[PDB]
Ligand binder design. Structure first.
Ligand SMILES: O=N[O-]
Ligand SMILES: O=N[O-]
Ligand SMILES: O=N[O-]
Ligand SMILES: [Cu+2]
Ligand SMILES: [Cu+2]
Ligand SMILES: [Cu+2]
Ligand SMILES: [Cu+2]
Ligand SMILES: [Cu+2]
Ligand SMILES: [Cu+2]
Lengths: 336, 336, 336
């Protein structure tokens, strides 16, 4: 398309919502290609990640960890206005794995505190993709400080299974998984700092052990449980987008399955089916489609169970509806 | 199916056998859906996992690590009588990744020492699946103490490749891989404990390093070698089911390949072919089909060679038959 | 086929070239099956792997880490003359994952210093495959000392996509990734040793932590960056073969994608498409095909960003050509 042709395309301003919820959108494209506009303000802020009051100096796109899910359709253009407030202390940028050129846009979006930039790229490939900050020389530090999220580029005709039958979800949730490397003092106690820069040296030493101190969903232990549990009802079709910008993960819905799973996160690659536990490599996003069949509480976890239950990578789904005794039944309840 | 219809189905009691062997079964289902009955007693027992005499307080389904492979066909019902003897000290349960609802059955099978329970579920999806204990709040500890195994839900018409051609194995083995985290003393020597509870705190500390001290097949270093090496013959078709309930693995048959590999372990997902090394994420089971073409010894290993040869993840196959010089030949034996 | 037939096949000697480059070959086979002859001399030598003068006693096939890529076509025979000079101190051999029998040829090629051997095997399966030294009892030590490479067995009719359309590359690169485990003294300084054997004990201790001190491409930090960046032009089709003989990796082309990726490395397994980050398990090779669309510098990395930017797994591609503003454009450059 020419610059003129692009300039004539309809524009649509999208309002982002905080994970795990996703902004309003239509699975099947409404009309031809458009320039979908988004704006995100970068916020360097302290976040508490566990019940011991452990702090991380988060570098959050739109104020959240992970950054919000942006949804467009194949061949639409995504135009992001990215803002770095003067209240911040570091330079930041953004690299869209969904984009083509200049390090995913990282090379064209380096903004110091007080600056903003506007990047536009054509979403030529359908699927879920990670996006993350990548400042030359300080790439992993920003990413493991929570500066990453994902976007979903839906096929214009919506989702389909391997044989072309449409797959239409009732609900969609975005789970961003984050590995954190929090420094500890001589007494095994997590350290606190009053400036992001202050923790850099100590954090790099922990990062080099390749052993995170915490692995969490939506920025903190228990973030997606209890009251923030995701919800659904028997019969509902749910798409769960999951990303990990720096380290491998292996999602599993305890009590359910991934009926269709685009493990590589790319829609032109046929989905795997009937999955118990799928795999998403560090630096990628994946997506699982499941139709709930039983009511109750489900644990959605990274299935290295130490990472899920000792380090924090566990979320819950609360499902309403009628119990199905054909699928499962307690013939004899626990007894002497 | 209604309660009445399920009650009318035929029932077959199966006698389990210890890994790596698999109880008798038919690849192609004989007759219509059945309620297949299994019984397993849980044994908390001390086991030795290496030649030095290192001990682990195992939590073992049917007394073995891994628990035995249960085999059924799609749409059969699996009815498990699970017994927790009064001689044990902890509450246990079971989560079948093959099942739908109540955390894989975990929420309906919590039994204290002195109790039993009977759970029935419909095996609606074909493939190999992990099953493991999962007591709320103590999940990884039970699993990495060896309380896990797998089941195989065969398609009613047996296995087929991705294009529909039947794949019939001559024999099958089940290799359960287990990551152990054994505490060490100040001399770097593994510690022993009177009771399993005494080891909890020290073990959790090791677990948090995400670095196992041992990674073994069938419960111990070298368990599948020597007189217990697996066997085959040139021309023989072997299915190798492999599971890891907590940590990733990358099986490799040194000197051979994975002709057909359902790396995700799900039979409705076409198998990869001509594999050198496949990948099974923690929390899943996979299966590889191979027709041996050369006689001799083969090493079957987790291909992180440090894990295979330093930590214990290596098994052997002894293969009988005639050498094929077309496939391979020593043109010049080692010489000056 | 018949004994006479194999004897009558043409023999062709090929001259190897050092990675990341690849010796001359044709994508579509030229003529019928041939016995392709290669010769490699093993070199035990000290190499420097980082900017701090860190040393490793490398065990290098053909004097390079990784060993060179050998290219043949399906059903050709690969006949390797492997030489171990009297100047070396250890016994070595070679295991081709592409081969069938005798531990990939390892059982037939054990050569002490001062000896040579000639192995021939039929390349019956198409794909890229790892080859590595594997002396019984010291397999990981040789492999993590850099004694590994890969071969590519192209289909006789060249590469094709999942729909049968031909995929012809303009150039090919071979990126071998190596995890090193270098001992450090109590001050944190990397240790140096007089002979390879002297470092054995200290090295195995580091290996058991499953945490490499360095993860590099082409044998050293920055080996494929700056003046040694790989190159391409907009519109050019490039195949990137990647291997890791001992540990998992997750390649990503920053600013690009893997248009077609044989993640398992086997050509009879349809390639995944539009990949952002792919996954190659330890003990395997994979291949990605990409058509460059934008000029500039690209970072090709292992996407656990700590491994890429702190440990060394980052390479660069320098691409020439015209910028495509349709694909990506800076609507507003960084500004207050
Ligand atoms: O799904 N937790 O084992
Ligand atoms: O390639 N090691 O079994
Ligand atoms: O290519 N690093 O995001
Ligand atoms: Cu940043
Ligand atoms: Cu990236
Ligand atoms: Cu238990
Ligand atoms: Cu589980
Ligand atoms: Cu060697
Ligand atoms: Cu190998």
């Amino acid at each position: 398309a020419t610059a003129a042709e692009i300039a004539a395309l309809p524009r649509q301003k999208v309002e982002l919502v905080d994970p795990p919820f996703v902004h309003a959108h239509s699975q099947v494209a409404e009309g031809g290609p458009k320039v979908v506009e988004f704006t995100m303000v970068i916020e360097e802020k302290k976040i508490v990640i566990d019940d011991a009051g452990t702090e991380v100096h988060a570098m959050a796109f739109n104020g959240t960890v992970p950054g919000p899910l942006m949804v467009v359709h194949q061949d639409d253009y995504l135009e992001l206005t990215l803002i770095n407030p003067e209240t911040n202390t570091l330079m930041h940028n953004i690299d869209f794995h969904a984009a083509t050129g200049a390090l995913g846009g990282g090379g064209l979006t380096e903004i110091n505190p007080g600056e903003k930039t506007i990047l536009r790229f054509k979403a030529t490939k359908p699927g879920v993709f990670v996006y993350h900050c990548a400042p030359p020389g300080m790439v992993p530090w920003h990413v493991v400080s929570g500066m990453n999220g994902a976007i979903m580029v839906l096929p214009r005709e919506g989702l389909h299974d391997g044989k072309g039958k449409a797959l239409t979800y009732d609900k969609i949730y975005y789970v961003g998984e984050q590995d954190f490397y929090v420094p500890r003092d001589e007494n095994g106690k997590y350290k606190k700092y009053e400036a992001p820069g202050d923790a850099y040296e100590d954090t790099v030493k922990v990062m080099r052990t390749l052993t995170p101190t915490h692995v969490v969903f939506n920025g903190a232990v228990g973030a997606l449980t209890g009251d923030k549990a995701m919800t659904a009802a028997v019969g509902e079709k749910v798409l769960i987008v999951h990303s990990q910008a720096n380290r491998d993960t292996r999602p599993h819905l305890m009590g359910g399955h991934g009926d269709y799973v685009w493990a590589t996160g790319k829609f032109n690659t046929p989905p795997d089916v009937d999955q118990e536990t799928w795999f998403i490599p560090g630096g990628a996003a994946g997506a699982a489609f499941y139709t709930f069949q039983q009511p109750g509480i489900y644990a959605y976890v990274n299935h290295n169970l130490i990472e899920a239950f000792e380090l924090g990578a566990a979320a819950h789904f609360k499902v309403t509806g009628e119990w199905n005794d054909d699928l499962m039944t307690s013939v004899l309840a626990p007894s002497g």
